[PDB]
Design a protein around this ligand. Structure first.
Ligand code: UDP
Ligand code: MG
Length: 351
DNA sequence: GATACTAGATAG
DNA sequence: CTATCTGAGTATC
């Protein structure tokens, strides 16, 4: 059994970028199941073999991490063109890891074709004809299908909590008690404003010491519909392998998602947050049935509620400690099922 | 005359 | 929101 994993639109090198981190992690946890896997990317590296030096068809399984098809500057993007060309040569089933509802697989030829540099490529190089199997992070396959409604070789869908991988790594450990410097914290990107309203609500104009790490920038929040005066402290991005330690700097860490993450997705940050020394607080709308934890104290409806809950968490260590003890318990139960998870994942890639 | 990393705006 | 169009701003071996 020879397994190849690749990121469709992002180069893979180390933990600098997130897409690069997800691919290496996915690479690791799969190797940890006792499988021989390679990461194919743009060049040879510590963790990667080059697309130009490997016969894609020497792999019994081709796993592909989801990405958009973004020709920045209206210019050719080597990351996307090289992986698709690679996928295009494969003749066996392709397993697409759909972890971001906004990153459904789609052919790039239709796009390249109508570009002024179409003459640089051809349909025979870019068109991916192999049958594709979508492995949705969301249990609601109906939505998964709809996101891939326009692609015909996508003929198989299956739910599987891909993003539980962090808590199932071999070296995984919950964070230790940490000296606090913040009341609330949140890590991530602007995600094209799909959460601008939620970010402003829970992180802007609160009076608390809030920090928003990640690639998001203060100047990106300019929608008059969601005005602000006092913004949280914007610090840049940090390696993915450190996120949970970063959250641990605050009393609490916010959980918010897009419109279609609500009661459908249980994202990675949920585990990264739940794993930290930061009391996890979820936006009510994100999980309206409280499926994550059967304890209303972990849920906030608005700014005022978040502000009340954070203040009551500082006002009392018995409460903060209790809530950190509970969430850690919920996580540790899910970790008890590692084998079960590993099993459904193999069966997910037909093993 | 740097290189790498990172969707945004708009009609239907 | 969804389908389709249009094309660079920011951080740094
Ligand atoms: O500086 C940062 C900020 C975020 N992340 C990762 O990015 C994820 C969040 O991605 P996104 O902003 O797309 O939000 P999501 O859709 O996952 O809720 C986090 O869970 C981390 O894994 C990271 O590695 N470094
Ligand atoms: Mg994700």
């Amino acid at each position: 059994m020879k397994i190849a994993i690749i990121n469709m639109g992002n180069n893979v090198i180390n933990f600098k970028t997130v897409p690069s981190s997800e691919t290496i992690y996915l690479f690791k946890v799969i190797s940890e199941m006792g499988l021989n896997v390679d990461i194919i990317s743009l060049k040879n590296g510590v963790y990667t073999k080059s697309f130009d030096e490997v016969d894609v068809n020497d792999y019994d399984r081709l796993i592909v991490v989801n990405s958009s098809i973004n020709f920045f500057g209206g210019k050719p993007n080597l990351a996307i063109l090289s992986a698709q060309k690679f996928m295009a040569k494969y003749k066996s089933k392709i397993y697409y890891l759909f972890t971001d509802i906004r990153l459904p697989f789609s052919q790039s030829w239709p796009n390249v074709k109508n570009r002024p540099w179409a003459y640089l490529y051809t349909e025979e190089e870019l068109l991916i004809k192999s049958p594709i199997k979508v492995i949705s992070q969301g249990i609601n396959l109906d939505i998964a299908k709809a996101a891939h409604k326009k692609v015909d070789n996508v003929i198989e869908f299956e739910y599987f909590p891909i993003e539980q991988y962090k808590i199932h790594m071999n070296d995984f450990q919950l964070s230790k008690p940490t000296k606090k410097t913040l009341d609330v914290i949140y890590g991530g990107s602007f995600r094209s404003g799909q959460r601008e309203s939620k970010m402003v609500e829970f992180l802007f104009d609160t009076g608390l010491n809030i920090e928003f790490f990640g690639n998001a920038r203060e100047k990106q929040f300019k929608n008059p519909k969601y005005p602000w005066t006092k913004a949280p402290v914007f610090t840049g991005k940090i390696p993915m392998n450190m996120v949970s330690e970063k959250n641990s700097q605050a009393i609490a860490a916010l959980i918010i998602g897009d419109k279609n993450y609500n009661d459908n997705f249980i994202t990675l940050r949920v585990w990264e947050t739940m794993a930290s020394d930061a009391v996890m607080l979820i936006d009510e709308e994100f999980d309206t049935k409280h499926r994550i934890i059967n304890d209303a104290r972990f849920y906030v409806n608005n700014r005022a509620e978040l502000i009340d809950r954070v203040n009551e968490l500082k006002h009392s260590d018995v409460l903060r400690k209790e809530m950190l003890s509970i969430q850690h318990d919920i996580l540790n139960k899910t970790r008890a099922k590692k084998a079960e998870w590993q099993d459904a994942f193999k069966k997910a890639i037909d093993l």
